Write a protein that binds this DNA or RNA. Sequence first.
RNA 1: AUAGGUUUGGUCCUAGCCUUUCUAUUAGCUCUUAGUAAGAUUACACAUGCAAGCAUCCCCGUUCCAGUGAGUUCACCCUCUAAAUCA
Lengths: 168, 54, 295, 53, 119, 193, 77, 86
Amino acid sequence: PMKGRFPIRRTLQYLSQGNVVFKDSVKVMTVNYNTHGELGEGARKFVFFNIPQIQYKNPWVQIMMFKNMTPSPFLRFYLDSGEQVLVDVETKSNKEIMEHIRKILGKNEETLREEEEEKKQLSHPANFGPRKYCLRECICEVEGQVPCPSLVPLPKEMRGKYKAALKA
Amino acid sequence: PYPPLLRAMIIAERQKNGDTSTEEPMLNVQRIRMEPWDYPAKQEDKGRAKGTPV
Amino acid sequence: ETKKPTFMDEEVQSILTKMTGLNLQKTFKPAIQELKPPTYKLMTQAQLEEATRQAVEAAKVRLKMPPVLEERVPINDVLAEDKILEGTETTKYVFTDISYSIPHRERFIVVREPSGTLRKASWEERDRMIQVYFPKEGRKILTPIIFKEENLRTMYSQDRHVDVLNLCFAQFEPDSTEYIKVHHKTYEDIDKRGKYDLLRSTRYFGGMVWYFVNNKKIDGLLIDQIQRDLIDDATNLVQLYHVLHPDGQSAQGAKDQAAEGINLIKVFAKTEAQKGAYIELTLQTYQEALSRHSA
Amino acid sequence: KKVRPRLIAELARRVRALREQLNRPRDSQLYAVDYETLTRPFSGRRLPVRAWA
Amino acid sequence: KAYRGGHLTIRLALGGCTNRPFYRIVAAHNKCPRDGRFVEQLGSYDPLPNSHGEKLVALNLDRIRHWIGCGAHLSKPMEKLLGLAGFFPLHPMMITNAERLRRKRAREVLLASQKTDAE
Amino acid sequence: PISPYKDEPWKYLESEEYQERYGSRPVWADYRRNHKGGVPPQRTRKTCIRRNKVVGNPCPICRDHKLHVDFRNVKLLEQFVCAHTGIIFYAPYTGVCVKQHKRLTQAIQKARDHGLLIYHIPQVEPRDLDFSTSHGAVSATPPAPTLVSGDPWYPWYNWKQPPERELSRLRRLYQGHLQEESGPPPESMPKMP
Amino acid sequence: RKTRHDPLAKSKIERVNMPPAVDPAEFFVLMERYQHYRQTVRALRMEFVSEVQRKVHEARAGVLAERKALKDAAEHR
Amino acid sequence: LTQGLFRGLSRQETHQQLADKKGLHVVEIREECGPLPIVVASPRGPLRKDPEPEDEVPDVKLDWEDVKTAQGMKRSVWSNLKRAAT
RNA sequence: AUAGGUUUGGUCCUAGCCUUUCUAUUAGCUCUUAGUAAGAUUACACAUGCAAGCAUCCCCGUUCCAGUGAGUUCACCCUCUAAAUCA
Ligand code: FES
Ligand SMILES: [K+]
Ligand SMILES: [K+]
Ligand SMILES: [K+]
Ligand SMILES: [Mg+2]
Ligand SMILES: [Zn+2]
């Protein structure tokens, strides 16, 4: 079987289920957490389960983790403007921490839908070209138009070989 | 006047936006000053032949 | 003053919605398509009732009735006539505006004829070109042969009316002549052979009722509803008939007699209903059976 | 990533640009014409037929 | 490929197979190959009459306007297609070519008439 | 051979001979391809009948000359389609040669187009959100002044005979390289009687 | 195609291209059409350039764009 | 192989055996039938009233071969080859 | 991979090799027609012909296209800002 405990974390399906997409202001995220203590259980679960999901959705944001530096766990975000958002995560569960940062620093569902709609316009159905980019390669595929010569030979009158023969 | 199609597309936007008007759209060609083809060009921007002699 | 209700009126929608019915087994019949291993969930009775409710909500979206539209008027508008181009080209040029973010009914599609006339494309050409460049799933550029009279009679012989309606909805536009023609010919076959249950629990029932009421031939549908113990739907059908024909003998009869419930059927049966005798006999049989069960 | 310098490419470039300034042809050489063949002896190119007259 | 100078142009890129031409309207750099790299596809032009006797032309008018507004030039065949569509005025050479054909056909009717009349 | 069912192919599938040979199983139930190895070639033989000569191991369709692949023989065509998913089996599945599989695939599509063979027709959504036909694109555009009067859209479409003075300049500039002057063009395109 | 360095063909050494014969009537009428045609197209081109510039400006510092920017800042605060 | 096959098929738990053990309805969700909830088995005994605890992350052992295929990472020229009806 | 053959007197395990599938070149033998697609082994040497002109002289172009794969993280993103197009 897949190595490690909770191998589900190392699957593309699990990594794409993160709902936290930081705004463009967020640049760095420092996770200070303690390895022992009941009050830091959520922070430990958040580092175990959710940091992979956050990084997957925010590839250009630097996430750095520090162990046992302070008596309590906390998150700190460094924004491009220079503002620092301190989020205390003591006593909170990993689900609560994830929902909290979505509210204060995550893009809403409307902002995301808009970005996806802009991508839809990049592929134009009417454009013809290679299958990697377009639906159809040639107009000959459209029914009613003159088929491709490779499939249906053209009439002798429409072929250049005999066009110049009838004339001369 | 605008060409046939462009005219029809400008009149349709008017009606769609709600503006009710019967004025004809027309292109202002007064700004475009068509100079003759033999008008002296700018010699300062013209190049020069290279040295390769025959 | 007094406008007769349209098909999309909330009142008509509620009446036609209830008349259609909601059979979850028919709405979500297993489709003959590529299959995948089913999934399983351990659910309580409370959770089971919640999923069933969500299926009712999803089923009601699947049953949303298409709007009934009037036949579109042919387009015959000439943008220009450049007589100088006459005789230069032997074939006409069809120019389609493929700007992505434009409603398809707001696109400029024009045709340059060999004579030099720049005219707007006809409704048929417009639909053909939109498919060429914005292909829709289930639509064909060339009219499928299924819609011929001979081919549509085979589909009816097999009781495949709902399939003929889905094929029409995908190929033709709601206001096209071919669209209205097929639905009108399908509704007629259902009436002649009394196959009203085929379209029940589908989004096509409302359109069928609307066609019958506006053509004064709700006799067969009323008989079927009574024979199937659907008085509530039958009374609503007669009620709706009165609203769309207020200046009618049956409408005035109910007004004069203040008929309600089953009385509305009797008043309409004698005055306007063509098969007044058969309706009375059918309604009679039901009322007798109902009296027995009450005991 | 450290590109290896090409010194001869820059040396010749400066020499060429210089020689184009010291050996540049004069208008007397460039725009001379043989009135019998109607060709510029500098390049040996024929003038357009519409300019011969 | 950074070219020396050049400009954007809306022109016809030939596709299809032998004896089956098909043109794609594309905005491409002046110096790029005919069927090579392009900036954006702006439509298509099927020059062969289809079953319905039509030559189909697609024109992304919203994007054609955008590129003409950014300094894109136009090839003669592309200018003649926009003239037939009514987006631009009829290119003068279509008017003159039409007039030349009228004169040729008018001259052809004389010899034909003379033959039938004289002989 | 000459089968008597060519005109009414559906009759063979209801005859006694068919029931004795096949019974209730599909015509291809017993066929087995002869090939080397455990994995068969990914294509079946091209054709079982070459120049009116049948090969050693004819495919299910070619081994029985009374089985006619026709869009009307709906019972035969159904045997070559998946009852649970509706997909046409690829040739290696049943062993039919490429020639007969191509005829079968076309007949199954023709039967489906004629309504003889039932297939899943999905419920599709409407193309347009709004059904209004009031936009100018589909409505009537107000005619332009030139169109109402019958004049050309731009005045320079029509031929205007140039002044005689201007014709003299061109005759001086292009001395010795001049064509016959052309008058106004015909008003309409002539035609060969 | 040939490069500047490639030598000229021997057969083309004596080739002289002769200009076509000019028709006075057709020549003048055609010259005016080009003058009008290019004037109309130049006006159209100018109109398209203005639209492109306006759309860019509207997206950069449009009232709706600035309003959204202010709303985003307020929401953050 | 034979002894292993008969060992697994003999020990497979039926839907009814699952419902009775769990005291909950077994609801089958079929993609071809939309969201229709098909109850395949119900507990013959009393039906529990508490919903089964939904663990956020399942601590289940995944087969790398399964995960690798779902991610389109498994290229094999021998898989999904056309074969005779079995 | 739905796998198969092969170690031994024989069994089980491990393991390599090979078989069956699908393509591309080359060889043998053989070969009827039509349409279409593709097409030196070699950055080895090349006979001959042609491949860039245009145009009232100035300019502009020949810096493109076409070719090859010798060399090889110059190709992508950002910042900044020449030349070029928008008369
Ligand atoms: S690829 Fe379209 S004609 Fe051949
Ligand atoms: K082995
Ligand atoms: K060979
Ligand atoms: K190389
Ligand atoms: Mg500059
Ligand atoms: Zn066969």
